[PDB]
Amino acid sequence: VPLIGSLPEARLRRVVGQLDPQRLWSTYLRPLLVVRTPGSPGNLQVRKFLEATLRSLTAGWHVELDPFTASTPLGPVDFGNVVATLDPRAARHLTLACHYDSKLFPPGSTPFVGATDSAVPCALLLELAQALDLELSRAKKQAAPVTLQLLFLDGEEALKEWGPKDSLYGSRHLAQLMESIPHSPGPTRIQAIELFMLLDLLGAPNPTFYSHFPRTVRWFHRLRSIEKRLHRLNLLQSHPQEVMYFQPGEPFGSVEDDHIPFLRRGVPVLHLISTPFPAVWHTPADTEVNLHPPTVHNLCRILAVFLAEYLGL
Ligand SMILES: O=C1Nc2cccc(OC3CCOCC3)c2/C1=C/c1ccc2[nH]cnc2c1
Numbered sequence: 416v417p418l419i420g421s422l423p424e425a426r427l428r429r430v431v432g433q434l435d436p437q438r439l440w441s442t443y444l445r446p447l448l449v450v451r452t453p454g455s456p457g458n459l460q461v462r463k464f465l466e467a468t469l470r471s472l473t474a475g476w477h478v479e480l481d482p483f484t485a486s487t488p489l490g491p492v493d494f495g496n497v498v499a500t501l502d503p504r505a506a507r508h509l510t511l512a513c514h515y516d517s518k519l520f521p522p523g524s525t526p527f528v529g530a531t532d533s534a535v536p537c538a539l540l541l542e543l544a545q546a547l548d549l550e551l552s553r554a555k556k557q558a559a560p561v562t563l564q565l566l567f568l569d570g571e572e573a574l575k576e577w578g579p580k581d582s583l584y585g586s587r588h589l590a591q592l593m594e595s596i597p598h599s600p601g602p603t604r605i606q607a608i609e610l611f612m613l614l615d616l617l618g619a620p621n622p623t624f625y626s627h628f629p630r631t632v633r634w635f636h637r638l639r640s641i642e643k644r645l646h647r648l649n650l651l652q653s654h655p656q657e658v659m660y661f662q663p664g665e666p667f668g669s670v671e672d673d674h675i676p677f678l679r680r681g682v683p684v685l686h687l688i689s690t691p692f693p694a695v696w697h698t699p700a701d702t703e704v705n706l707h708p709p710t711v712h713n714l715c716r717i718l719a720v721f722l723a724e725y726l727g728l
């Protein structure tokens with residue numbers, strides 16, 4: 416049931432046991448469920464919550480901000496990404512990414528906080544850096560050569576409906592900055608990224624994922640192999656069938672998301688997005704109540720394992 420690189424079943428359980436669903440739901444998810452369109456008092460609130468939550472970690476994450484400003488239909492706008500790098504001097508790193516801005520809808524409609532789009536991912540990343548903190552802290556003390564980088568991207572969502580120059584403000588910029596910064600080896604910080612794992616649209620019930628990239632299908636398989644186990648170990652909730660989320664296959668082929676600026680620059684990209692989109696994207700019906708906490712806590716579990724098998728924690 417396990418491939419090569421896999422964890423031993425004893426660790427895995429020990430690991431899993433470090434996850435704390437109440438923290439996930441009540442510490443990191445519930446307070447992101449505000450409205451956080453770019454340059455909003457809430458888009459600010461969240462940005463600062465992220466910065467300070469991650470900085471509170473023992474492992475010593477080096478958390479920088481990527482503040483900038485860009486011309487957009489609603490005029491000039493003040494964006495700000497949150498780049499948290501566990502070990503900046505290490506040569507390459509796994510990058511988990513997701514955006515923390517909520518799309519902007521017209522005024523008056525019920526306010527849109529996009530539970531799945533993308534707070535549940537933002538929260539997952541947090542719980543993962545916390546659960547596995549001491550483990551990640553070890554690796555960093557023992558000079559591990561591949562570390563972990565958490566990107567919380569602002570300004571994914573258009574402001575006056577999609578378009579190349581009105582979309583992905585946050586990603587398009589950090590990929591621009593990252594390409595300017597030299598790195599040894601490298602030559603740029605863009606090559607630091609050994610793999611761009613992009614979470615988006617997670618937390619709706621009964622999702623389905625696929626390999627939109629054959630460059631990285633190796634890791635999707637693993638992601639699928641990590642599902643069952645856990646199913647075969649009675650460690651997933653509401654998981655009657657064995658493979659359910661990570662299905663086998665190939666295309667669509669692509670859907671436009673925060674990974675794009677980095678693929679132009681030749682980065683390996685695992686797009687980890689629900690295809691199809693939840694039945695609630697893009698409505699004011701994307702709210703804490705329409706999620707499926709089990710499905711959330713399994714994705715967290717799967718991811719947590721992956722992270723441990725990937726960085727050899
Ligand atoms: O922002 C948007 N408003 C729309 C309204 C109608 C259809 C749409 O999709 C078309 C257009 C581009 O995307 C795929 C088909 C969109 C849309 C795109 C989109 C895609 C993936 C995302 N992940 C997080 N926000 C996302 C937004």
Ligand SMILES: [Zn+2]
Pocket residue numbers: 518529532533572697
């Ligand atoms: Zn969205």
